[model samples]
Target chain A: NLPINQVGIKDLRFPITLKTAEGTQSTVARLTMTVYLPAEQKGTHMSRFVALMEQHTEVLDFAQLHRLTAEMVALLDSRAGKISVSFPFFRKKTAPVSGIRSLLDYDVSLTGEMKDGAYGHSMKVMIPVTSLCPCSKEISQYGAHNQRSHVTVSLTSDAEVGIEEVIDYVETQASCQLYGLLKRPDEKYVTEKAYENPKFVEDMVRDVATSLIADKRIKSFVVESENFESIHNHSAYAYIAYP
Target chain B: RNLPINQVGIKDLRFPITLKTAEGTQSTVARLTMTVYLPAEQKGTHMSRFVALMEQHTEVLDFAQLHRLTAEMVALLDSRAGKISVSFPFFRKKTAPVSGIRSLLDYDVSLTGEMKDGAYGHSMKVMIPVTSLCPCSKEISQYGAHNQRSHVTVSLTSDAEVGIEEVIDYVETQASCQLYGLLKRPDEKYVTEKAYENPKFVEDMVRDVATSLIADKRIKSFVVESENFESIHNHSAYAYIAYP
Candidate 1:
């Protein structure tokens, strides 16, 4: 006899509203909800997973997500469980040169779990930035190989960290942060910025991981960078994980 | 001033489609990116024609039908080279290990057709999800082991046609254990233990799949990628292996 670990629905797309510093913003979330099932139980009630969303109306935050995760485990009649909310979160950024602002999309996922009467949550953010290779810059006389890179950081903690703070930390560490709308001046600034500040895939994760580890609020974390290189067909990826 | 565009047409055009595989055919929605090479004299390739091509061709999209569509795109657009990329969620009926119950499991599939200077080329990409148990986890643990879902994407360019299911089988066979849409208690135990018994890392996954792909004469070249969503960790263990 064996207990089923984490069984539930995957890829449930639903509308959700998040209460932020500016205002309440709405987005569609693709979620995966799971609960631990005892060996004696034939199966966890799958219908309730959909019903939970159908009935849920609460505006979301770390506190709200904690409440939801606890409620879902109880509704499934399980003592331990997890809830993952994945969505596209947008933030407005001002260009360094032009001072014009436009919204940039970020991939965010929030995970809430309760195990052995203890609750902890995790937040994952995927940020895209322009990365110029240090080796390419050093070797080439004129221009270096450059492409977009995805730097992802997932932090687990008992306390809450705002989404914008995490994004800012990663962006500052990148060669150059991306912009949705860039004019001639803004484009020139970014290209020059990336050329001046070149980072390897290893450097991207190490710098972010170091910054995250220095923070007292983050209990555990993982930082990863996947560089879709312009020079190569395969990606350059690296990650640093903490215990 | 004369500058020719290498490829320019449309991106992310959502359309309904019927995809044909070896198992059977199912109707699903697809996001298509159809484009062609435009000469320096031409200002632009007709954007409307890309959508119009889909509007007129209402048939099950198999290898042959897709090729015809790509060639037609070049001819209609009056270009020497063109391509069509269609991506959709492909479903397959699966039976539970213990219960013999049947249900559908969805996989992401993309079909690509190209004509470069009037020479035709084709590629198929499929992403298959399965259970991956870390060899380190199993070896380190005494009583419990950590296992999670891993996605293995197979991108192949071949002279001969390959079915989507064929690519699925090549990956699922190499995975520690394949996933199910619905599984009972007994079935869960089977999969959980199966994955535990057959553990492979992100590196092992691509190499195993590569061996099978290279042996087949039908496949010319391929790129296999495996990303494991680690159960104990918050991030994924990723791998990418491409072959000649």
Candidate 2:
């Protein structure tokens, strides 16, 4: 038997509260908690992982994530362990024109690990916004086809970066931010805003990466943008990673 | 040994595919789930051939094409029955209601082919996303109405050719308001007012879609499901209607 790098349960949905730029927000998170297994051990206790979450206190913060990973390693009786929690993080937004407020949801994941008695964590956010193709805008006589683009920035900070900050970075980099409920004026503003601010899938990842690069607090980052282009059946995808 | 597995094979195999639609052939990625009726006495079935078949074979796929594909799979495996299901994102062009600014919207589609005891059949499934506004929320509230995205899936085993676009057209026409990737101010206002005017609950959505499909004579059986992600609540509203 050989050692297993990762072995454990996935798709365990749990309720978690995230202390973010906003107040503490409670949301459902789908987790993948795993640990390393030695060659001598044929199996690992699966229930202990669920028990770990059961025993965990509410409110998952930056330090809480680190503590949880360390606790998991001790509970699973493993030298190294990893936990990934994926959830939808919602933020309140005011209509650019209507001055009305509503909530928009974004996909977020927080991952923590314990290795060599050291603890670290990483975060990723999938921010969806309007993307207008610059090439299309240049060539087209009138209107350029615009669609929603998913820009995901997964990074590890030397100190830490809040999820909301990451969302803000990605949002400012896009052609235009998305709104849940847009009134007539707000729709016009967005439609025209995207038309004026056009970006290629290439442009999105590069712009987002440079934004992160300016922040010396971040250790390393990987930014990817997948534009579900309105013109084509397949998406236009690109990614940039730092050394 | 009388125990026979109803179905067992590969699951979640990602592969590139060319889909045959009303316009023409479009290339996309598909998640294939290939399985078959594994009878007793044969210790196991060949797993390599399943991937091999797809590797060697490449063509524009449709309902009739899938039937042939599954039939070939059954003969290649030397089995009495087998099934091959392919699911992929299907995109359609939508023209803005006012501006005529066209954009593409993605939908979920699955085409399954099955052969049992020499009888072959296929079914088409489509999940279309649309906006659903809550009637109660609209009536109760004076200013703003709550609305969210809703996914309505229509699966049917039909006798004749019912193009994927036809199924999509049915669901879109029945939804409160069809979704589009690009919507200008005029179009946005139209969609918003239209959805507010035509609000339906998850239950009403499925029944309306099911009723429309059930009236078609070329189909034998059908099922419709609507999963509405309510803007007011974290939980989703779901309803399904199955007919014979």
Candidate 3:
């Protein structure tokens, strides 16, 4: 008898649509769909996984993800299964000074799991922001070191939380928000603003965590920040998870 | 008649590894892809041997050690040609530009080895993160320019053993400004002004790095790529160059 904990397709790139305020938006996603197999089962019907994905070409929300996980378990004849999809989510943003609107992309993921008739799901977003080092600012005489930092927030909820709301909240917690296009005035504004509001990786994660805890819509969350240090080659990382 | 399989193996296998550095052994996690050409008559390659070999060889892996590992893989599997590629996160201590304070900086590094017809070949790759200031934006703008984090990947096949540090340094020289782990106020100003003074496009980065690589006799062939995660645009600006 051969048994596997999780077996299915990974790194499969496909087109998917997401619901937005301005109607429906389409983007390509990298997906991993898997199911658990018992020792007695010889193998799974891998083709069925692809077939199921092909059938659904519409907008994918949390409700759609829940149904997908349930259908996967039923189709695979397994007790547990999972579906994960990650894609670049774009939204329009107005510059801080110029007021010029541009599209900014955020990496987003939706994970759904079904086990023993219970369903669980989570939404994750990675937002890149400017992070000025507090230590560097404190020690330096002229300017503070700042670099691009990625802040990832993952949350599980029974009710739907707006993706824009989550993204906006995280962006506010950073030293300065990132933009796709910026005029000269906007660039100077962001540069000076970030230099004034320097933060450490630890500070960013904890602050984001506190904001997440205050939100009643979120059941639980994991907030992490990775600072691509300007002075050193390695990144400074910090993570916080709520129970 | 049986058909021949050019490449068949596993991808994205993550494992912990120790690497041979100039100072000593540095431990890091690596993502690996191992494959071998299979004769048409053979049904499949032994997937378990890849894991077994990785488990057995838990030492400071260098170019010579990787060549030996590839040879062993082909011998164990009775294959004509075999290839193994491993990419990992590497860290080195760096000093701040002005303060001279030291901190650790991280890099994405990889090594690939292939053995065919009793000849072994090895290639090394490093993805170095640096600051890229757009020359166009700087020239057009009055006060500030658009700058963003850019990744420069240099892949080269070499007959002689090349130091990872040497390749990283050369790539950094081509960028507008290099990155560091920790920096003080003076260091930050120095880097910011330095990048502002020297603006380069994504195309400029790869071409300049390629020119340096072509001049080096040690490198037989190379492919250099640059991806600028544009601060002004959501999409990245990308460019690549390959030498025959």
Candidate 4:
């Protein structure tokens, strides 16, 4: 087999616009782009990735994710090209019962790759949810063990899904949604809310998966739940995936 | 209506811990930084819940313990939303290149995660220290060479089958010299000469480390980064590579 030349850039930080379910949002993202180098070529064009990003920076949308991958492959004149964008996404959420609003941050990723003259892309969004321990609630008289959980929904398909919509779906399945800020009433309300909805690590992952199954936009997806166990020295985790 | 947070999750918490080493159990304290995840609709995440869990287990930690603690954290919070991060300086015994005198040096390791429903996913990181001898420094100078401290950081998801000690061992083997907290004069002299004899650039650092990690079958995927604190210049040199 003949060897191929490879060229790409990694860990490039830039500011870009994101299309979310609620609206268009602006944030900073870390991007990595690369293309295969053929044996005939001495070196691959390294600056083409940045040039394409600059050319398309004005319009940032998930709808263009595949085109972006195609553009890199075409611009680089390579057999295959890949692009990945990861950013910290924030949404405004209100404290339960108090009606106070604050921002919640989640890390999200969008990736696309083109090979053999074809293109495909995937979306991964991590939603922070509340996981209350069933064992703790059952064993304890009044209080139960609960901690923050992040459910990541990764999908590949033609459908367009909003990050906010996916996050909302996961939150509904969870005992409660995590927030950046909270007050006393919010605390009491959340504490009791968790107590009322006790779940195990496996329960959270399965519930999240079930919720995703009900969403039409999600053609195929994986849901993972992890609890930072407060009673022990380690964490509990479970995951489920559907095609 | 805006009510001040009845209680917010605590931050920048530090504590002592004992670690299990291959030779025997060793006593060392780790500095921990964490945040509690409270439901957006509710006012707060349980602050005491994190401490209560730590109080229960002060023994050695491996992959199993890490998993168990996460489940316990979910139980303690009573909410599906929770995030926890623990970072500490880990020490390993090393021998001098020529003399082979044994001593211990510390590097950083960080584990972090957010768990909800039933699945918990976590990331583990290891920071390795090495010496970088500047190629330009060697070429420009008539006799002496410029050298600086370089750090290589690797982060990856842990599979239950792997151990933390194994990761540390792999990283040290690739570095120019694994650091030591205490060193005798002969050891110091050996390190200085070794670095001078073998000069490497930031690019070299990335390539060499990546080559080693790629060869290791145990590592499923990894991010390798190197930063050189240039001795002669104000700006630092850096490079990063990752496996998809």
Candidate 5:
């Protein structure tokens, strides 16, 4: 007898509605839905995963995700279930200097797991920002080396936390924030700003960690930053986990 | 009569695959996308055949093998045109600059094959992450220059066979400094200085890669893209070039 830990669909793309600043917005999402299979069961009903999607026709939120997972466990007659959906979430961003607005896309995902009548929900977002190396600034006589970096923040919260708030906090930790479009003056401002504020990958993660830890709403969090080192081939990465 | 769909297939099918390397073989997980053209007359395609063929075939996927597989897929579907795209993370053992310590560096590699009108076409692409330093930053500033992780993706279509290793090596030379998985303190210093000495912009990277591809007679056409995760800004500095 053999049992599978996770058995279900992977990378199934479909259109979905998400709650955004401008009411509900429609976007395409890639989803992975799975359930645990016991040794006695030979297979899982894969068709039910799609069937469940067909039944629900509302904007997906944390509460909706939990209900979905609970239904999945019941539909498949399994002990545990998980559902994850990742999509490109866009927001309108205004330039620092020009005040021009453009759409900026961020990779966002919601994951939920249910077992033994207990459920856990987590949200993740990958935020791209500018990172300047402190070591490069200290060692060099003139300009410091900097590059585009990604700060990924994942958190488990007891209540609903605003996605915009989390994203804003993470951007503050970076050397400079990113924008979709910039004029020459905005370019100059960002370049000078990043040069003035230098931080290592370690600093980026720790700074975000401190903020997340202090926040009462966040139960636990994991903050990671990856700096694409302009001077080296590989990335410089650091992560901080909170219990 | 109804409207015809040009292409319909599965996307992001993850599975285990073995690749034929120069020394021996390496095993890795590959993400594949397979599609076939549907005629106006046909209602739908047999999706199970694509999955079945992948399950049954087990071998080191080389250029010839992939070409043959595409031909077989078209025949099975009773279609005139079919396409297959597969990508995976490939690791190579690389030595550090000063310390000489060896580590495995990873690269993103993809292979695509197409069969149409009884003819076959094959192409390969490798997204190599390397260091890039800005020439403007170096010249304008008195001291250190800006640098970042830049991805140089080289996609080439060819009649003659070309090894993935050879193409990867060629692309690495165009970068400011090739990357390593692990580096000692001295190695790190060496890489920093190496990039400082050799600086190139995103525009420079794609043009340099195009020059090499043009000289290689084995390649018929190619598209080169360079995206510099700019340290000075939040967005990437991008450039692209294609040749006939």
Candidate 6:
């Protein structure tokens, strides 16, 4: 008899530092941890997972993250240990007109597993960029439906890549980059900038995929882009990945 | 030419609702949004069908049990494509800082969205209450620094399941000061002093939180948001980051 069919913990949040590809900049992160139990044990020690997390330090890259999962599985004496961390990462951005610097937020995620003594890891990042509707820009008399769009980039990597670099790649693929602290002058600049640069969901997804294809460290990848339509009650989205 | 879509989904829709609570099931309202996909050649997705499903039940939610309700949506729709999402105000029991009085304060929200495609996939979100101490205020002020309400929202999109209580704990630990539903004068003083002691600017708050999130092993994807309701200004300040 299996001691547990699906025995693992959930929703454990903690603090972390995320290392960028540049190897110099680190962004803080919030994380959750869990592992599966075999039928032989009555219960897994829940507190020990927290203890292991409390002992962890350093920027979590793909390689280092895998080691952590493996260690967790070994410590728990379980068949598999799974780990996940997600956090708001900040990047310095220059205002479109003023050129003033402000930090913009991007969401990032990493997941790893240690099962059968093998390790695997995946990274996810969301770049909030600007997208102007081609139909809206073309059909509307005055303004187009330009709202913030998210280009979600997910990759299974062979090596560590800086999140900043990933963000840059994703943003360039967007109609424009969204700013955290934009002034009136900057707003006008972005308005016109986006107006001139119109993108459909198709354009955004393909562009992101094109960027990921250029990265050697990304062994497998998926790209999803969603637009928050200003005029409509719903959103438009598209996604694609290597099979 | 518009070919019939294999799946045409309605992504975001908001509505008011009541949820059951632990203390004899109180009536609290919330805003819910969700997506429902219609197969190609279908005239339209039953946009109101999902809301009709939610309207049928009024019960307090336990993390694990919520998944069943979501799965039931697909079956009710008579279609393979279905999704259910609910974001509502959640109140937690708290003791006052100094007086130790008990009261319930509302956290901005908690959400659970589940999908079924042969198997079930579910996500849970818990937004934690916190105070943000502006580093710039400390740098610029002479007598005292400015602080405001900020929230550290954590959403888990994972295969490994997690409990709502566990998610709440993660958020509280990373906050500058956790909020209480009820507080006496002493508790207020305790909260004020605690926030001052933990002084954090948006930058500091982001950095402090990321350290813990990146180390966790169970999370598949996450997004954290910090919105600072500035005490001095009309506009609020906000920051966001996420992992896929």
Best by TM-score: 4
TM-score of chain A considered alone, across all candidate predictions: 0.97, 0.96, 0.94, 0.91, 0.93, 0.87
lDDT of 5 by residue, A1-243 (tens): 988888988876555678854555556577899998999898887756766765677788777888889998899888988899997676667788888665555778889898777898889999989999888889999999999898999999978776777888888888999875566788899999999999999889989999998899999989999999998999999998999
Alpha carbon lDDT of each predicted model: 0.86, 0.81, 0.81, 0.69, 0.84, 0.67
Model 2 clashing residue pairs (backbone): none
- Tens-place lDDT digits, model 2, residues A17-109: 889767788999988787876646645666688888898876898888888899888988999878889999999999999988999999999
Q: Give the TM-score of candidate 4.
A: 0.59
Interface RMSD after interface superposition, each candidate: 9.5, 21.3, 23.6, 12.4, 20.5, 14.2
TM-score of each: 0.55, 0.53, 0.52, 0.59, 0.52, 0.53
True contacts kept of 5: 0.00
Q: When superposed on Cα atoms, how far off is each prediction in RMSD?
A: 11.7, 19.9, 22.5, 9.6, 22.5, 12.9
Candidate 4, after superposition: displacement of residue B112 in Å?
17
DockQ-better candidate, 1 vs 2: 1
CAPRI quality band, candidate 4: incorrect
Model 6 chain A is weakest, by summed lDDT over 10 consecutive residues, at A1-10
Please give, for residues B94-149, the per-residue lDDT of candidate 1 as tens digits: 77898876655778899999998778899999999988988988798787678888
lDDT of 2 by residue, B1-244 (tens): 2234445455567899988877778889998877666564553456557788898887788877788899888888888998898999998877999999999999999988899999988888999999998787888998778999988888899878788899998899899999989999999999999999998866567767877787889888988877777776444555555676
Ranked by lDDT, the better of candidates 2 and 5 is: 5
The model with the greater TM-score, 2 or 4, is 4
Candidate 4 local Cα displacement, residue B219, angstroms:
10
| Model 2 ranges with Cα > 4 A deviation | B1-244
In model 1, the runs with Cα more than 4 Å from the true position are A1-44, A47-243
Q: DockQ, per-model, please?
A: 0.03, 0.01, 0.01, 0.04, 0.02, 0.05
Each model: TM-score of chain B?
0.97, 0.96, 0.95, 0.82, 0.95, 0.79
Q: Report the lDDT tens digits of candidate 5 across residue range B85-173.
A: 99977767678889877655667899999988989989999999899999999999989999999999999999988888788888898
Off by over 4 Å in 4: A1-10, A34-56, A71-78, A94-102, A139-141, A179-193, A214-220, A230-234, A241-243, B1-128, B132-244
Sorted by TM-score (best first), the order is 4, 1, 6, 2, 3, 5
Cα lDDT tens digits, model 4, A28-94, are 9888777765534444555566788878865467767788888888888878877889999888898
* Predicted model with the maximum DockQ: 6
TM-score of 1: 0.55
